[PDB]
C-alpha cells in the first residue's frame, strides 16, 4: 500500500460526442432502483484476426 | 489428402518400429504437405471431408 | 499445362479467408459521406455521377455600354473560381451541374482528401 | 430487371434506369457482352448472374461470400501493431515472391454462350512452431527450433533419476551426466561409444574430480566391458585423461 | 423476411462501390477506351508515321494568335459605401506549393486605404484616387499564383489574374459585397493611368 | 489524429484498388509477371545485349540492379528473367520450374542513387550513392557470389562530387564520359577512356556550376558527344556546350515549369526533341531550335514525377512514372486530335496508355531493346513488375 | 456482516455478465471506478454516494463474435494512466486504455479461450493469461514480447481456468478442472533473469529471436482436495483457499503445517486441508469470487442469487459463523463478485446483465 500511495493515478475521464461517428449504437444502462436510467453511446472495438485453435504442447 | 503429394510408411529401424514420411513426387518451395490418413470413407467425411481440388475437364 | 483452364481452378468450398475491412471506418466514411452529400448532392440531385452547383452573385459590374455582369460564386466553396457572367446569364446558370470528368484538378482533394493521399505526406525521402 | 437474393427468404428487384448502363459504375455498356463483362470485373464483391425477361433480359445477384477481398501486400503487415503496421518508411525483409497471371489473353469472340494463377515461392507468413508466435522473415533458416534434445527432456528425465531409491547419491549423479551426453549428440551404434567415452572423458574429466566420482565411474566403465561395447585400452586411456 | 435487414446486409459492399466509384471517375486505375469489349472508343488506327517537326510551326502560330499584353498601372476611384466609418484595402500574392512545405504559402502586403464615411448613399462629398504601379509581374506570375485582394473596414475579397493568362477585370464600374467577421458593399470604377 | 486515421483508410482503399487492377489485369494487359524482392532497389535497368533460346519462347532477359536496406548490408545484385517469345505456347505458359532467378551479388555502400552502364562497355557501371564517390564496378571481373567479408571493391570510382546526388548520364559516342550531379550545385565530368592506374578513385575530369539551385539530373546529347544539358530543382534546364569556355555559363537556358523540375530525356530518333516532366503533375517538351516555346504539355498525372525516357523502335511514343503510383502514356502523333465523348471522358487524344498496377510507389519503370512494348518498374514494395500492353491499342 | 443493497443496477443488453473488477491502482480522493465486461461490451462505472452509480465509457467488440470472459485493470508508469485488458472466447488480449479513448496493444497466440486475466503485483507489465489451451503464458506489455509459459507437457492435461499471485508476487497458484493443485516460483533465479533481459530486449538489435522459457515443474501438486470441478482458488497469505462445484470452502495449506511454502520441494505430495465454510445450492462452476484489499472481509455469491459473506479475524472454520446475505430481487444467477478497496462498498452482478450494490452500514 506504501507505492500505492506514492504512484499518482489519473482519474477517470467521461465520454465525449463524436461527430464522425454519430451513427454509433447508444445503450441506455437500466438503472433497477429509483435512479434514472442513464444512456452512453457505444464504441467499436479494435479489429483483429484469428489463429485456429491448438493445445499447448512440446 | 486423397491424393498428397507426401506418404506415410511405417518404418522398422534398431528394434523399434517407427514411422517414415516421404513425398509421393517432386516438391518445390513452399508447398504445403498432405498425407493420406488410410480411413475408411465413412470415416473419411466424418474427419477429412475436405481435399480442395475438382477435375479440370 | 497447355491444357491448363481459367483461373477458378481451386477448390469447391474453403474457409472463410478473414476480410482486410474494417466495421467501424464504415461508419465513418458513411458519415463522411452523409454530410459530403449534404453539400454536393452526388447522391440525390447527380444521381451518383453529378454535382449541383446553387449559384450566387459577389459582386455586380456595369461597362460603359449596356453590358452588366456578375461574378458568379456557388455554394459548395470547394468550386471552380469565380466567373463573370451577364444578367441575362442569371436565372439561367443559378442550378450548374457539372460532371466528375469536367471537374478542375485541384478540386479533386478539395472534396474528399481520401480521392487521393499522398503516402509520404512530407519529404521523410525520396 | 435486377433481383436481389438472400436465400430467397427475402427478396428485392428493381427495373433499367435506361437500358446497357451500369447501376454502380454509372458506365454506359451499349453492349449486352459489355454489360455483364463490366459487372463480372468491376464489381468481383458481388456475384452476376443472367436469369432472362419476357423482353430478354434480366440480372439476379448476391453476395460474394468466398469474396478474395483481403491484404495482398506483405503478409507480416497485418498481424504489426498499430502505428507500425503500414509503416512504408523503410525497407521490410520478406521472402521473393513471383507470380504469373498471364500466358496469354485468349481475345475470344463476344458472345452471350461464353457465360453459364501460376504461383511461385512464397505466399503466406510462417508462424513459430515452438509458440504460435509470428516468425519474421530474418530468421528463414535458424529457426529449426529443435536440435538433438529438446530441454525440457533433461529436466524430465533427471527427475525420474532421483525417483530412484536403491541407488546411493554418488552412484545416482553418475547415471546422469552419462545419459545427459548421449542424448546430447545421439550416438545410434557401436563405434560411436567407443570413441564417445574418450571424448566424455575428456568433456568432463575435470568435473569428474569435483564431484569425486572418478572411482563410481570407473565401476561403469567396467560395466561397459561387461556389455562387451568397449575395448580394452580403452579403459586405459580413460584413467590418463582422468589424472 | 423484412428487406430492412435483407438491405442491411448488403449497404457495406454498396457504400464502398459507391465511395470507388467517386475515387474511381476522378482518379481511375486504368483506361475506360482500351477495354477490348467497348472497342468504339479509341477506335481510330495509331499511324506512327506522323511527322512531329510541324508541332513547333503549328504551335507558333498559336502564340502568335495568342500574344497577350496588359494595360499600364492599376488605378481605381472611390464611390460611396452602403449599408443599413472608413475602410482599409489590402493586397495578396498566391504562391503554388513546393516539394518540401504541406500547402502552397501566401504572403499579404497593405495597397492602401480610405476615409469612406458612414454609409454614405448620396451628395456626401465633393473625387478621390488610389494609385497602384506595376506590382503585378509576368515574370513572377510564372513562378507564383495568380494575385488577389483584400478589403477591410467586415472582410471581403477579390482576385485580379487567371491561369488562362488573360486578366479578369478591366476599365468598368465594380460594386464589391461585404461580409463581417445585400449587406454592407463599396462601389468604385476602375482605370489605367 | 484525423491524418493517421484517414491513411488507415486509405490502407483499405489502396488494398481494393489493386484488387481491382489485377482482376481486370488479364483482360487488358497481354503480359503478367511480377517479382517481388527481399530488398528495395532505388534503381534498375536492364542489359542491352539479350539472347532468345532457339525454340523456347522464353527469353533470356537479365536485369542490372542495387539494394537498399535498414542496416544491414547491400549488394550490387543483377537478376535473369525468362519471358515468352511466343504466345501460342500455354507452369501456365512454360516449365514449372520457374523462369526467374538471381545470379550476381556485389557489396555495395549505402543505397544505389543511379546506376548505369557504359554503352560503349555495358559490362562497366558507374553506382552513385549516398557517399561522394561514384562506385564503378565491372561484374564480369567481379565474383558473382557475394563476399561476406563485408569489404567492396568499386575499382575506378569516381570523385569530384562533394557531396551524393541524383543524375547519371553516360555519352553516347565519347568513350568512358558520364556527366553526374549533385547537391553541389556542380555538375562532375570523368574520361574513363583516360583512367591510368591512378589510385582506384578517379578525379572529376571536368567541373561546371552553372545552376544556383542543387542540380539533380544532366544528360547528354544522344547524338551529338559535344551538346548535353542539366536540369535542377531551380525549375530551369539548362543547356550546355563542350569548349564553351567559362563551366559557369550556358549556351542556352529557359525556365520549365511551375515547381521542380527533376527529369530530363532526349529523343534518340528525332535530334531536336526534347521532353521533360516536372514535379507539378507536368510533363513538358521543347526544341533544339524553339526553347522560348513549349510544344505541348501533359496533365494527366496526378502527383510528383522524376522519370521519363523515350520508348526504342517507337519514336512517337513517350512515358513517365511518378510518386502518384501512376504510369501514363502519351502517343505524340494524337496530340490534338479529334475524339468521341467518350475518348474525352477517358482522357485526352495525345494519351496513349495508364498503368497503375501496383500497392506501394513505383520510383523507376524501364523496357529493353528488340522489347519496344514490354516495362519493368520499381515499386517500394520491392514488387518488379513486367507487363506488355494488348495490340489492339496500337493496331 | 453489516452489509445492505443500497444500488441496483441492469445493463440493457440483456447479455449474462462476466468478470468485474475494482480500481484498486488509485490514489486517495480518486474517483470510485469499478469495470465490468459482458459478452462483447465493456464498461465502467463509478460508485457514488446515496448510493448513485453515474455511468461511465462503454466500448463495443462490434468485430470479434465472441464472449468475452476475463478483465482486470492496468497500470502504465510511463504515462501515469490507467488501463485495462480483456479477453474471452476468442482467447485475444485487448488492453483500453481509457486516457486514449482505444487500445493499440494486441496479443494474439493464444489457443482457445481465455479464462483468466490478473497482473503481477508489483510490475504492471507482466500479465500471465490463462486459456483453454492449457497455457500460462505471460506477456511483457511495456515491452511486447512474450514470457516464460509455465505448465506445457508435464502441466494440466485439462483446462486451467484459476491462477492467483501471491501478496508480493513471489509464487503462482493455479488450478483447473484437472483438479491438479500446481504453483510455479517466481522466485526462481532463472526467469527473473529472463525477466531481467525481456525488459530491454529489442529485435531491431538483432536478428535472434526472442527465447521465452518454458517450463513444466511445479513447486508442488495435488488432487486429493477436490472429486468435483473446482472453480476457484485464491492466495491466503501462507494458506490457499478453494472453491468447487461441491458447495465446500476449503482452505488449506500444502504438507503439514509446519512445511512452508517457499521451503517445500516439488516432490512433496501431502496436504494440510484447514477450511470447513460450507455452502449450498451454488453446484454450477465457472463462479468466481472476490476479496477486500486488506485480505479482511470475503464475500460470496450464489446461483441462486444469495449472498456468502465471511471474516478473515480470529472467525475461523473451527466453527464458521457464516453470515449470509440474501436479497429477494437478486436471486436469477450470481456471475461474478468484486470488493472495491475498502470494507464499505461491493459490488455485485447477477447474470441477467443485473447490477445489484451492496454498501457497509460501517
Redesign the interface.
Given at each position: 500500500?506504501q507505492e500505492?500511495?506514492q504512484?499518482?493515478?489519473?482519474?477517470?475521464?467521461?465520454?465525449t460526442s463524436v461527430?464522425?461517428?454519430?451513427?454509433?449504437?447508444e445503450?441506455?444502462?437500466?438503472?433497477?432502483?429509483d435512479?434514472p436510467?442513464?444512456?452512453?453511446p457505444?464504441?467499436?472495438?479494435?479489429?483483429?484476426?484469428?489463429?485456429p485453435?491448438?493445445?499447448?504442447?512440446? | 489428402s486423397v491424393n498428397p503429394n507426401c506418404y506415410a510408411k511405417v518404418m522398422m529401424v534398431n528394434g523399434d518400429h517407427r514411422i517414415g514420411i516421404f513425398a509421393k513426387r517432386a516438391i518445390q518451395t513452399g508447398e504445403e504437405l498432405f498425407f493420406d490418413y488410410r480411413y475408411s470413407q465413412a470415416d473419411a467425411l466424418k474427419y477429412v471431408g475436405i481435399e480442395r481440388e475438382m477435375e479440370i475437364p | 499445362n497447355k491444357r491448363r483452364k481459367l483461373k477458378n481452378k481451386r477448390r469447391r468450398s474453403l474457409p472463410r479467408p478473414h476480410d482486410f475491412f474494417d466495421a467501424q471506418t464504415l461508419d465513418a466514411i458513411r458519415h463522411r459521406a452523409i454530410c459530403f452529400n449534404l453539400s454536393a448532392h452526388i447522391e440525390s440531385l447527380g444521381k451518383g455521377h453529378s454535382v449541383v452547383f446553387h449559384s450566387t452573385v459577389i459582386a455586380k459590374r456595369k461597362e460603359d455600354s449596356g453590358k452588366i455582369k456578375l461574378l458568379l460564386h456557388w455554394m459548395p466553396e470547394d468550386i471552380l473560381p469565380d466567373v463573370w457572367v451577364n444578367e441575362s446569364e442569371r436565372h439561367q446558370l443559378k442550378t450548374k451541374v457539372v460532371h466528375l470528368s469536367k471537374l478542375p484538378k485541384d478540386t479533386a482533394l478539395l472534396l474528399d482528401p481520401n480521392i487521393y493521399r499522398t503516402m509520404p505526406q512530407k519529404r521523410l525521402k525520396r | 430487371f435486377y433481383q436481389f437474393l438472400y436465400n430467397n427468404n427475402t427478396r428485392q428487384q428493381t427495373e433499367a434506369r435506361d437500358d446497357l448502363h451500369c447501376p454502380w459504375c454509372t458506365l454506359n455498356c451499349r453492349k449486352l457482352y459489355s454489360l455483364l463483362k463490366h459487372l463480372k470485373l468491376c464489381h468481383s464483391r458481388f456475384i452476376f448472374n443472367y436469369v432472362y425477361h419476357p423482353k430478354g433480359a434480366r440480372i439476379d445477384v448476391s453476395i460474394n461470400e468466398c469474396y478474395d477481398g483481403s491484404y495482398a501486400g506483405n503478409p507480416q503487415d497485418i498481424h504489426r501493431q498499430p502505428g507500425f503496421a503500414f509503416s512504408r518508411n523503410g525497407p521490410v525483409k520478406r521472402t521473393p515472391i513471383t507470380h504469373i497471371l498471364v500466358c496469354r489473353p485468349k481475345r475470344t469472340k463476344a458472345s452471350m454462350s461464353e457465360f453459364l494463377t501460376y504461383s511461385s515461392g512464397h505466399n503466406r507468413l510462417y508462424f513459430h512452431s515452438d509458440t504460435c508466435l509470428p516468425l519474421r522473415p530474418q530468421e528463414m533458416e535458424v529457426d529449426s527450433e529443435d536440435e538433438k534434445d529438446p530441454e525440457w527432456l533433461r529436466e524430465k528425465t533427471i527427475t525420474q533419476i532421483e525417483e530412484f531409491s536403491d541407488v546411493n547419491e554418488g552412484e545416482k549423479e553418475v547415471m546422469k551426466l552419462w545419459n545427459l551426453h548421449v542424448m546430447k549428440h545421439g550416438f545410434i551404434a557401436d563405434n560411436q561409444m567407443n570413441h564417445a567415452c574418450m571424448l566424455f572423458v575428456e568433456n568432463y574429466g575435470q568435473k569428474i574430480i569435483k564431484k569425486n566420482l572418478c572411482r563410481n565411474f570407473m565401476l561403469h566403465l567396467v560395466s561397459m566391458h561387461d556389455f562387451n561395447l568397449i575395448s580394452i585400452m580403452s579403459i586405459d586411456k580413460a584413467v590418463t585423461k582422468l589424472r | 423476411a423484412d428487406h430492412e435487414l435483407f438491405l442491411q446486409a448488403f449497404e457495406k459492399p454498396t457504400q464502398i462501390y459507391r465511395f470507388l466509384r467517386t475515387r474511381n471517375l476522378i482518379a481511375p486505375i486504368f483506361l475506360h477506351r482500351t477495354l477490348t469489349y467497348m472497342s468504339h472508343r479509341n477506335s481510330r488506327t495509331n499511324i506512327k508515321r506522323k511527322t512531329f517537326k510541324v508541332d513547333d510551326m503549328l504551335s507558333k502560330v498559336e502564340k502568335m494568335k495568342g500574344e497577350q499584353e496588359s494595360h499600364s498601372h492599376l488605378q481605381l476611384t472611390f464611390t460611396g459605401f452602403f449599408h443599413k466609418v472608413t475602410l482599409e484595402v489590402l493586397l495578396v500574392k498566391v504562391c503554388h506549393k513546393k516539394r518540401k512545405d504541406v500547402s502552397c504559402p501566401i504572403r499579404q502586403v497593405p495597397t492602401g486605404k480610405k476615409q469612406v464615411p458612414l454609409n454614405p448613399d448620396l451628395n456626401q462629398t465633393k473625387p478621390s484616387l488610389a494609385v497602384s504601379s506595376n506590382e503585378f509581374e509576368p515574370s513572377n506570375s510564372h513562378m507564383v499564383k495568380s494575385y488577389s485582394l483584400l478589403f477591410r473596414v467586415f472582410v471581403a475579397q477579390m482576385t485580379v489574374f487567371d491561369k488562362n493568362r488573360r486578366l479578369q477585370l478591366l476599365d468598368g464600374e465594380y460594386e464589391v459585397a461585404m461580409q463581417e467577421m445585400q449587406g454592407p458593399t463599396l462601389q468604385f470604377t476602375l482605370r489605367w493611368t | 489524429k484525423e491524418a493517421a486515421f484517414d491513411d488507415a483508410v486509405e490502407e483499405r482503399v489502396i488494398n481494393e484498388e489493386y484488387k481491382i487492377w489485377k482482376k481486370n489485369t488479364p483482360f487488358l494487359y497481354d503480359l503478367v509477371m511480377t517479382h517481388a524482392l527481399e530488398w528495395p532497389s532505388l534503381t534498375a535497368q536492364w542489359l542491352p545485349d539479350v539472347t532468345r533460346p532457339e525454340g523456347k519462347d522464353f527469353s533470356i532477359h537479365r536485369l542490372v540492379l542495387g539494394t537498399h536496406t535498414s542496416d544491414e548490408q547491400n549488394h550490387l545484385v543483377i537478376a535473369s528473367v525468362q519471358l515468352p517469345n511466343d504466345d501460342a505456347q500455354f507452369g501456365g505458359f512454360g516449365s514449372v520450374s520457374g523462369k526467374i532467378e538471381i545470379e550476381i551479388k556485389i557489396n555495395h555502400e549505402g543505397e544505389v542513387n543511379r546506376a548505369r552502364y557504359m554503352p560503349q562497355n555495358p559490362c562497366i557501371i558507374a553506382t552513385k550513392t549516398p557517399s561522394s564517390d561514384v562506385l564503378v564496378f565491372d561484374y564480369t571481373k567481379h565474383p558473382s557470389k557475394p563476399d561476406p567479408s563485408g569489404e567492396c571493391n568499386p575499382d575506378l570510382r569516381l570523385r569530384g562530387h562533394q557531396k551524393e546526388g541524383y543524375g547519371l548520364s553516360w555519352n553516347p559516342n565519347l568513350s568512358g564520359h558520364l556527366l553526374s550531379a549533385s547537391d553541389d550545385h556542380t555538375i562532375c565530368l570523368w574520361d574513363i577512356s583516360a583512367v591510368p592506374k591512378e589510385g582506384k578513385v578517379v578525379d572529376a575530369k571536368t567541373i561546371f556550376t552553372g545552376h544556383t539551385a542543387v542540380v539533380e539530373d544532366v544528360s547528354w546529347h544522344l547524338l551529338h558527344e559535344s551538346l548535353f544539358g542539366s536540369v535542377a530543382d531551380d525549375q530551369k534546364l539548362m543547356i550546355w556546350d563542350t569548349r564553351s569556355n567559362n563551366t559557369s555559363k550556358p549556351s542556352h537556358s529557359v525556365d520549365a515549369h511551375t515547381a521542380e523540375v527533376n527529369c530530363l530525356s532526349f529523343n534518340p530518333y528525332s535530334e531536336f526533341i526534347l521532353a521533360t516532366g516536372s514535379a507539378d503533375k507536368t510533363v513538358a517538351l521543347w526544341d533544339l531550335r524553339n526553347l522560348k516555346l513549349k510544344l505541348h504539355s501533359f496533365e494527366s498525372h496526378k502527383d510528383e514525377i522524376f522519370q521519363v525516357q523515350w520508348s526504342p523502335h517507337n519514336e512517337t511514343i513517350l512515358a513517365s512514372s511518378g510518386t502518384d503510383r501512376r504510369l501514363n502514356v502519351w502517343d505524340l502523333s494524337k496530340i490534338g486530335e479529334e475524339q468521341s465523348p467518350e475518348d474525352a471522358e477517358d482522357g485526352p487524344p495525345e494519351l496513349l496508355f495508364i498503368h497503375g498496377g501496383h500497392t506501394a510507389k513505383i520510383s523507376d519503370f524501364s523496357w529493353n531493346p528488340n522489347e519496344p512494348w514490354v516495362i519493368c518498374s520499381v515499386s517500394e514494395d520491392n514488387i518488379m513488375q513486367v507487363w506488355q500492353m494488348a495490340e489492339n491499342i496500337y493496331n | 456482516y453489516s452489509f445492505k443493497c443500497v444500488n441496483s443496477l441492469k445493463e440493457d443488453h440483456n447479455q449474462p455478465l462476466f468478470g468485474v473488477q475494482f480500481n484498486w491502482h488509485s490514489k486517495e480522493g480518486d474517483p470510485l471506478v469499478f469495470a465490468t465486461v459482458g459478452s462483447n461490451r465493456v464498461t465502467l462505472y463509478e460508485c457514488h454516494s446515496q448510493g448513485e452509480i453515474r455511468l461511465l465509457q462503454s466500448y463495443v467488440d462490434a468485430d470479434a463474435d465472441e464472449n468475452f470472459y476475463t478483465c482486470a485493470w492496468t497500470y502504465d508508469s510511463n504515462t501515469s494512466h490507467p488501463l485495462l485488458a480483456v479477453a474471452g472466447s476468442r482467447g485475444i488480449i485487448r488492453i483500453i486504455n481509457p486516457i486514449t479513448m482505444q487500445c493499440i496493444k494486441h496479443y494474439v497466440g493464444h489457443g482457445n479461450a481465455i479464462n483468466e486475466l490478473k497482473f503481477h503485483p508489483r510490475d504492471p507489465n507482466l500479465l500471465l493469461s490463462v486459456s483453454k489451451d492449457h497455457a500460462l503464458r505471460l506477456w511483457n506489455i511495456q515491452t511486447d514480447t512474450l514470457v516464460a509459459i509455465f505448465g506445457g507437457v508435464e502441466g494440466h492435461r485439462d483446462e486451467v481456468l484459476s491462477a492467483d499471485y501471491d501478496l508480493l508476487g513471489e509464487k503462482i497458484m493455479s488450478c483447473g478442472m484437472d483438479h491438479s493443485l500446481k504453483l510455479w516460483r517466481i522466485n526462481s533465479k532463472r526467469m527473473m533473469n529472463a525477466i531481467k533481459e525481456s525488459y530491454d530486449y529489442n529485435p531491431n538489435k538483432t536478428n535472434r529471436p526472442f527465447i521465452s522459457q518454458k517450463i513444466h515443474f511445479p513447486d508442488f501438486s495435488t488432487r486429493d482436495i477436490h472429486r468435483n470441478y473446482v472453480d476457484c482458488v485464491r492466495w491466503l497469505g501462507d494458506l490457499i483457499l478453494s472453491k468447487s462445484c461441491e458447495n465446500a470452502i476449503v482452505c488449506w495449506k500444502p504438507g503439514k503445517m509446519e512445511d512452508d511454502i517457499d521451503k517445500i520441494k516439488p516432490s512433496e505430495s501431502n496436504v494440510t486441508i484447514l477450511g470447513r465454510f460450507d455452502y449450498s445450492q451454488c453446484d454450477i462452476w465457472y463462479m468466481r469470487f472476490s476479496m477486500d484489499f486488506w485480505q479482511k472481509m470475503l464475500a460470496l455469491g450464489n446461483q441462486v442469487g444469495k449472498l456468502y459473506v465471511w471474516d478473515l479475524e480470529v472467525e475461523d472454520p473451527h466453527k464458521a459463523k457464516c453470515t449470509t446475505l440474501t436479497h429477494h430481487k437478486c436471486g436469477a444467477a450470481i456471475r461474478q463478485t468484486s470488493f472495491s478497496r475498502d470494507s464499505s462498498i461491493l459490488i455485485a452482478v447477477c447474470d441477467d446483465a443485473s447490477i445489484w450494490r451492496w454498501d457497509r452500514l460501517r
Open positions: 500500500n500505492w500511495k504512484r499518482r493515478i489519473q482519474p477517470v475521464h467521461i465520454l461527430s464522425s461517428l454519430r451513427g454509433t449504437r445503450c441506455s444502462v437500466t438503472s433497477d432502483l435512479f436510467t442513464q444512456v452512453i457505444l464504441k467499436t472495438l479494435n479489429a483483429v484476426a484469428s489463429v485453435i491448438m493445445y499447448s504442447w512440446s | - | - | - | - | - | -
